[PDB]
Amino acid sequence: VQLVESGGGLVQPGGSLRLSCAASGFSLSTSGIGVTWVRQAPGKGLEWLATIWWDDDNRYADSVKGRFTISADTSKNTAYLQMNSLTACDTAVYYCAQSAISAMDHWGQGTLVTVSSGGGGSDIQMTQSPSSLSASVGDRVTITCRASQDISSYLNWYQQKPGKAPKLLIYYTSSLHSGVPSRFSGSRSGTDFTLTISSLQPEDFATYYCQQYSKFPWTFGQGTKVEIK
Amino acid sequence: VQLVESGGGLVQPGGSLRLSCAASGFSLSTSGIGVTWVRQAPGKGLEWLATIWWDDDNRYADSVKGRFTISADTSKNTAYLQMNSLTACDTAVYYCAQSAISAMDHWGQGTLVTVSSGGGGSDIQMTQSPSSLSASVGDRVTITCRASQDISSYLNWYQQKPGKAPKLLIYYTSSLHSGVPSRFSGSRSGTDFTLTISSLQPEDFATYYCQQYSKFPWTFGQGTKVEIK
């Protein structure tokens, strides 16, 4: 028994692909036989996606429901996975496997599906430090942010409280947004950027984010949570 | 200036939603004005999605390209995010924000979009231990796996080598797949399951996965990598 897989490749987001899985040495119409699709994102584990049985019964995972359909064509003795409206989160090696009556056997060799519209470059990665800090009212607080490439001074800082939308604090590295208290300031060293709170006030416990706009895509740091001691 | 957001909610995978963002105190047609959409997955940071400017220029992130479209309706002074073919990975609070000429200001209050077809229950979570182990040829090796609920004996074990498809080793807790060497065995204690390799051979360095089939969705453990010392 063999399952001979084909299809896959690099496709733009929103696009569609059909994977095929030709059965050899058994018939998809035989009572007890099912075909299952499983995927494995790069560096990750195994995720079940869908199973279809000889009697038409079928199940789908929520990760593909409403977008992918599984089928078995008894005239070609081939199973298919029709993927529509693909996203970057669907990037993975996709396997078909024989199910029988219950365990997955005789897996296909897998095919990589990568969903991307990008060139070969990388987005600008913003790294903040620390990811959390503890402070008391009255403390001086400094938060740092660095970019994976030169962004000149095209950096903004935002504050976000739980359950609230972000608020702009500083634009273009050092310009205080009008209405924001002057205890907030921003600076850069040419390797890094710093947000300083000269004397922390009770209303300043929040999460702070940097954001570059040197180029699209605009990207944010991971956030720094300023928490009470 | 205010941006008044509306829309969102709980929607099935593959479905569509339109978010709205009504401008107050400024006009979307004014030179220099843009509207940007940003999202925040539960517990995570901020992700830029798309910007549209008064002069029609626009940019989209790869995470939404081909599926979502942004627009500005000058007759209603309202901006929109049309979301199509939604996935679970799109679950997040979505914000609109005013851009101007460059920083995001006057953010909307955010709306939660949750993409799910599920009831209120949880999938069965399989936890293996350890996630990696070091061994020498000839060693006895034991790998454990537990389920977040009672799966009886409906558990399989698989082996996966780099670049290869998984291979079934044991089904229904303790049944060796024919052709697999007898040094592999499986057992259960009623709280846990164990895969044992009585004497590790060079061909056994691989990653091992457990998998439950008590119910759909079928779920896998995170894997245990058996590596050389």
Calpha distance B216→B123 (Å, rounded): 8
B88 in the same domain as B131: no
State whether A99 and A176 are in the same domain: no
Query: What is the domain extent for residue A29?
Result: 2-115
Token pair for A112: 């990589």
- Record the tokens describing residue B82, joined without a space: 């049309």
Which CATH number covers residue B168? 2.60.40.10
Domain boundary, last residue among A51, A82, A115: A115
Say whether both B110 and B130 belong to one domain.
no
Q: Is A90 helix (H, G, I), strand (E, B) or coil?
A: helix
Residues in chain B: 229
Q: For residues B88 and A85, what is the distance between their CA atoms, to the nearest angstrom?
A: 13
Q: B72 and B28, same structural domain?
A: yes
Same domain, B185 and B83: no
* B168 lies in some domain: yes
* Residue given tokens 């082996």 in the structure block: B159
Residue A178: phi, psi to the nearest 5? Answer: -55, 135
State the Cα–Cα distance between residues A104 and B156, nearest whole angstrom.
9
Amino acid at residue number A175: S
The sign of the dihedral angle between the CA atoms of B117, B121, B124, B128 is positive
A142: Cβ–Cβ under 8 A, 6 or more apart, which residues?
Answer: A194, A195, A196, A197
Nearest residue to B135 (alpha-carbon basis) of B205, B185, B193: B205
Residues B111 and B131 in one domain: no
Q: Tell me how many helices (H) and strands (E) chain A has.
A: 0, 21
Instruction: Give domain status of residue B121, yes or no.
Output: no
Question: What sign does the dihedral B17-B23-B28-B34 (CA atoms) show?
Answer: negative
Same domain, B87 and B139: no
Alpha-carbon distance A211 to nearest alpha carbon in chain B (angstroms)? 9
Partners of A25 in beta bridges: none
Number of CB atoms found within 10 A of residue A182's CB: 7
Measured CA to CA, the distance from residue B213 to residue A90 in angstroms comes to 23
Q: How many CB atoms are closer than 10 A to CB B193?
A: 27
Please indicate, yes or no, whether residues A221 and A144 belong to a single structural domain of this protein.
Answer: yes
Which has the closest alpha carbon to B217: B107, B108, B100, B118? Answer: B118
Q: Is residue B95 part of a domain?
A: yes
Is B225 within 8 Å of B175 (Cβ atoms)?
A: no
Is A102 within a domain?
yes
CA B16 to chain centre: 19
Q: Are B57 and B39 in contact (CB under 8 A)?
A: no
Q: Which amino acid is at A139?
A: D
Are A158 and A96 in a shared domain? no
Report the C-alpha gap between B170 and A102 in whole angstroms. 11
Name the 3-class secondary structure at A203. Answer: helix
* Residue A201 to chain B, least CA–CA distance (Å): 23
In a domain, B152, yes or no: yes
Spatial CB neighbours of B189, under 8 Å, sequence gap ≥ 6: none
Cα radius of gyration rounded to whole Å, chain A: 26
- The Cα–Cα gap between A123 and A127 comes to 13
Give me the long-range contacts of B196-201 (CB less than 8 A, separation at least 24): B196/B140, B196/B141, B196/B142, B196/B143, B197/B140, B197/B141, B197/B142, B197/B226, B198/B140, B199/B138, B199/B139, B199/B140, B200/B135, B200/B136, B200/B137, B200/B138, B200/B139, B200/B140, B200/B141, B200/B226, B201/B137
Other C-beta atoms closer than 10 Å to the C-beta of A163 total 8
The 8-class DSSP code of residue B172 comes to T
Give the pair of three-digit tokens for residue B136. 């020498």
**Is the peptide bond between A162 and the residue preceding it cis, with omega within 30 degrees of 0?**
no
Declared resolution, Å: 1.4
Beta bridge partners of A196: A142, A185
Distance in angstroms (rounded) separating the CA atoms of residues A92 and A45 = 10
Element (H, E) at B164: none
The experimental technique used to determine this model is: X-ray
Last residue of a domain, one of A84, A115, A146: A115
| Beta-strand relationship, A132-135 and A224-228 | parallel
> Strand A141-147 vs strand A47-53: parallel, antiparallel, or unpaired?
unpaired
A85 and B89 in contact by Cβ < 8 A?
Answer: no
**Three-class DSSP category at B180:** coil
Residue B80: both structure tokens together:
């929109």
B174 inside domain: yes
Q: Do A89 and B87 touch (CB under 8 A)?
A: yes
Same domain, B168 and B103: no
| Residues of A in Cβ contact (< 8 Å) with B67 | 13-14, 85, 87
- CB-CB contact of B68 with B62 (8 Å): no
Residues 6+ apart with CB under 8 A from B145: B126, B127, B128, B129, B155, B157, B192, B193, B194, B195, B210, B221
Strands of the sheet with B141-147, listed across from one edge: B126-129, B141-147, B193-197, B184-188
Give the span between the Cα atoms of B172 and B146, in whole angstroms: 14
Backbone angles phi, psi at A140, to 5 degrees: -80, 135
- What is the Cα–Cα distance from B151 to B213, expressed in whole angstroms? 8
d(CA A147, CA A129): 12
Q: Which of A 139-178 lie inside 8 A of B, CB atoms?
A: 154, 156, 158, 160, 164-168, 171-172, 177
Q: For residues A9 and A112, what is the distance between their CA atoms, to the nearest angstrom?
A: 6
Residues B78 and B133 in one domain: no
Structure tokens that stand for B173 in this block: 């807790």
CB of A138 less than 8 A from some CB of B: no
Q: Is residue B187 situated within a structural domain?
A: yes
**Among residues A115, A140, A173, which one ends one of the domains?**
A115
A26 lies within 8 A of chain B by CB: no
Q: Is B221 on the interface with A (CB under 8 A)?
A: yes
B83 plus B182 within the same structural domain? no
Integer Cα distance of A32 and A17 in angstroms: 28
Backbone φ and ψ of A111, nearest 5°: -135, 140
- Rg of chain B taking only CA atoms, in angstroms: 26
SS3 A70: strand
Q: Where are the beta strands (DSSP E) in A84-223?
A: 92-100, 111-115, 126-129, 132-135, 141-147, 155-160, 167-171, 175-176, 184-188, 193-197, 207-212, 219-220
Q: Rounded to the nearest 5 degrees, what angle is found at the Cα of B49, between the Cα atoms of A81 and B100? A: 160
- 3-class state of residue A89 by DSSP: helix
For residues A166 and A160, the answer to whether their CB atoms sit within 8 Å is yes
Whether residue A120 lies inside any domain: the answer is no
Strands, DSSP E only, in B63-183? Answer: 68-73, 78-83, 92-100, 111-115, 126-129, 132-135, 141-147, 155-160, 167-171, 175-176
- The total of structural domains in chain A comes to 2
What's the gap between Cα B89 and its chain centre?
Answer: 6
Query: Helix count (H) and strand count (E) of chain B?
Result: 0, 21
Burial A138-153 (b: 16+ CB within 10 A, else e): eeebebbbbbeeebee
